[PDB]
Amino acid sequence: GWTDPTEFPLGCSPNVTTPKNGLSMELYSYDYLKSGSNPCWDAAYLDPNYPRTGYKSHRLLAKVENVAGNINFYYHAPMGCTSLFDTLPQAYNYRTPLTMTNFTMLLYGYFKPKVTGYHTFTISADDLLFVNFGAGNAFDCCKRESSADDFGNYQAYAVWGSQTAKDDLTVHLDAGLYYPIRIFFNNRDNDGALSLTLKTESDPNPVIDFSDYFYSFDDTKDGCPGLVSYDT
Numbered sequence: 001g002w003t004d005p006t007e008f009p010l011g012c013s014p015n016v017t018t019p020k021n022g023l024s025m026e027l028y029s030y031d032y033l034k035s036g037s038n039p040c041w042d043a044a045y046l047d048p049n050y051p052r053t054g055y056k057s058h059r060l061l062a063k064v065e066n067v068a069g070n071i072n073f074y075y076h077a078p079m080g081c082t083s084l085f086d087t088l089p090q091a092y093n094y095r096t097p098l099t100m101t102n103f104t105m106l107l108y109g110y111f112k113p114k115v116t117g118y119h120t121f122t123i124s125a126d127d128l129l130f131v132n133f134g135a136g137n138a139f140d141c142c143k144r145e146s147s148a149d150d151f152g153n154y155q156a157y158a159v160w161g162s163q164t165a166k167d168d169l170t171v172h173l174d175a176g177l178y179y180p181i182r183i184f185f186n187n188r189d190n191d192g193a194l195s196l197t198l199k200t201e202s203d204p205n206p207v208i209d210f211s212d213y214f215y216s217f218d219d220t221k222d223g224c225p226g227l228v229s230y231d232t
């Protein structure tokens with residue numbers, strides 16, 4: 001039950017006077033197979049455990065903080081089956097060129113709503129985007145480090161070329177709470193793309209700039225369970 005994704009995800013109440021803006025990010029290599037191979041790309045990204053522990057067998061490229069803003073991109077590769085260096089959008093706070101054609105990316109932190117009510121998050125990706133959302137499902141309130149690998153069934157998932165290449169998740173959220181979120185991305189080859197949008201009833205248009213929504217909090221000994229609750 002604890003890590004299963006739900007329509008009423010659990011949020012958190014960190015004790016934080018001055019919250020740190022943006023999500024944390026980790027970038028890892030995703031090397032091609034030997035030049036001339038067909039298939040040319042490493043298939044590891046489809047392994048159920050690649051997003052849990054497999055990516056750790058790859059090279060750590062960087063740890064980045066303060067990922068905040070519009071994180072969506074479409075990277076158009078000039079050639080397929082070819083590693084090419086380019087840059088991520090500004091939101092990612094990572095200015096140096098990386099292999100945009102082939103890389104793994106993990107984001108985590110907390111999502112703070114602006115208006116209490118239903119939130120629909122929509123995702124699409126090339127090649128892979130797996131999203132967890134809520135305490136337990138993503139990780140435990142102010143206990144991320146100790147629960148980081150224990151995420152549950154994805155609230156949304158998108159895999160290019162599969163039967164689910166676009167997805168969404170609809171959750172009821174309270175604007176006073178901060179919700180654990182985990183976003184796992186992979187580009188295996190060629191084009192790379194990530195789209196996350198948010199729809200609520202308070203705006204007829206989607207939200208694409210998450211500047212005001214993404215936070216990071218330090219873990220604590222006792223954790224920071226949500227202090228707003230409506231269940232009976």
Ligand SMILES: CC(=O)N[C@@H]1[C@@H](O)[C@H](O[C@@H]2O[C@H](CO)[C@H](O)[C@H](O)[C@H]2O)[C@@H](CO)O[C@H]1O
Nearest residue numbers: 041079080081126127160188189190191192
């Ligand atoms: C040019 C070549 O030798 N092969 C390419 C393939 O590598 C190419 O790759 C796929 O592209 C899709 C997007 O359309 C997606 O990014 C996959 O991750 C990627 O493997 C495929 C389609 O472009 O066929 C040839 O063009």
Ligand SMILES: [Ca+2]
Nearest residue numbers: 126189190191
């Ligand atoms: Ca791709």
